[PDB]
């Protein structure tokens, strides 16, 4: 499982988006019998929290998920070639750390809950 | 919950595929206050790992999941009547233990990631 882990860390975002399963499979597994257990418990919570995010968004069970949130040029004005072909995910995460929680809120609030309510109303027509 | 657990272990695979929820519901729950806790933690990890497999495949949230991996006669030449009507899951698992990781790799690599990328590209047409 470990093999290939973080190998595309220095690759472009496009090239590094085809190895998502390699990172995904590496997120899940005498006081030293307690502390290690705590670490195991910690890993589970982190995994579940990320999965919870994917579930409050319409992204449950997916590694690549398309959404209805428009991109804002304030978050980033770079082209697609300057993000996917000429840029790595670490650089992108360093720039967009500043805006992550606005995008997360837009993902959580407007799009998924309005889409879910609209499916609730279309299903009773 | 426990009632009916593994009851279809000796039944045919077809008959035993209608009781999947009975097994699914039984997977989730002083040094003896630590060891038991470790066991509980262990159960969670196992559950999550299986769920993780189902998520890296296109099978999240399903107990029966159809895929795009063709069956290979090298894995098994038996008919459908000799698998579903005249055979149990333990016998099937004993034969196909030898081939499980090839099927798992084909499930993980070609079909789900190519399908996910193709949906990523169809959604922008």
């Amino acid at each position, epitope marked *: 499982v470990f093999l290939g882990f973080l190998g595309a860390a220095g690759s472009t975002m496009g090239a590094a988006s085809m190895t998502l399963t390699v990172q995904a499979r590496n997120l899940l597994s005498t006081v030293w019998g307690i502390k290690q257990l705590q670490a195991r418990v910690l890993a589970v919570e982190r995994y579940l929290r990320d999965q919870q995010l994917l579930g409050i968004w319409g992204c449950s069970g997916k590694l690549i998920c398309c959404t209805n949130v428009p991109w804002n040029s304030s978050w980033s004005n770079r082209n697609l070639s300057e993000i996917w072909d000429n840029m790595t995910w670490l650089q992108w995460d360093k720039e967009i750390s500043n805006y992550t929680q606005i995008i997360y809120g837009l993902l959580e609030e407007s799009q998924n809950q309005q889409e879910k309510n609209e499916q609730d109303l279309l299903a009773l027509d | 919950v426990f009632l009916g657990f593994l009851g279809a272990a000796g039944s045919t695979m077809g008959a035993a595929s209608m009781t999947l929820t009975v097994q699914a519901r039984n997977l989730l729950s002083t040094v003896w206050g630590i060891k038991q806790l470790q066991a509980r933690v262990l159960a969670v990890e196992r559950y999550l790992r299986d769920q993780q497999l189902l998520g890296i495949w296109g099978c999240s949230g399903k107990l029966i999941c159809c895929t795009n991996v063709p069956w290979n006669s090298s894995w098994s030449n038996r008919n459908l009547s000799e698998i579903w009507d005249n055979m149990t899951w333990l016998q099937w698992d004993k034969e196909i233990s030898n081939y499980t990781q090839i099927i798992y790799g084909l499930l993980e690599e070609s079909q789900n990631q190519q399908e996910k990328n*193709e949906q*990523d*590209l169809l959604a*922008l*047409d």
Partner: antibody
Amino acid sequence: EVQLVETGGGLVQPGGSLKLSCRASGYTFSSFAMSWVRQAPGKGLEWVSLINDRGGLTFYVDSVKGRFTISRDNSKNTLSLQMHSLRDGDTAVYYCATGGMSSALQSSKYYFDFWGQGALVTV
Amino acid sequence: ALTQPPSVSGSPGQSVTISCTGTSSDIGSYNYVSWYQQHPGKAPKLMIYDVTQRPSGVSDRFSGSKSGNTASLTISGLQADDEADYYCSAYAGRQTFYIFGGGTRLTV
């Protein structure tokens, strides 16, 4: 530099099964989507089929949807079109071209950028 | 299919505006109208894409524009070497992709 060169073109009868092959050079073949577009001798251009950069998504016009089959090999840089049950309306110069779509991670390429010499097909 | 004038004419140094009319589902729904120039005996060449955008190597004399459900190709500075059949291409959705118009005979 982009050189598209079609072959396999000739003459066939109704019900024929004709295979064309377009060889590409001068650019990254696997990075671009490809299309086949046809021109009847006395008419204008008609789009026939589209295949994406990975060769997994194929699109056809209704008139050929169940008869034509676009395909690609990215190691050999070869685009191919297999037409079965050829009809009298399929007589045309067929051209292979680069473009028609792109993946979500690229800019839109809803146009045919580069073109081939063409290949005459008489049913 | 798109409706396009069968032929136009213009004297050298003058400017012509080939037109192109489509339904609202294609020209009036997507801003993806491209223009191709085909000389007799050769294959088309992308003069314009995305309504107003020119491939590199293409002279500035060729320009495009849209108006509702109509597109146009303004060819200024007409030269003898512009004598070609011009074609429209509009993107028309996912159930159908590319619709071409008829050819326009340009004479000088």
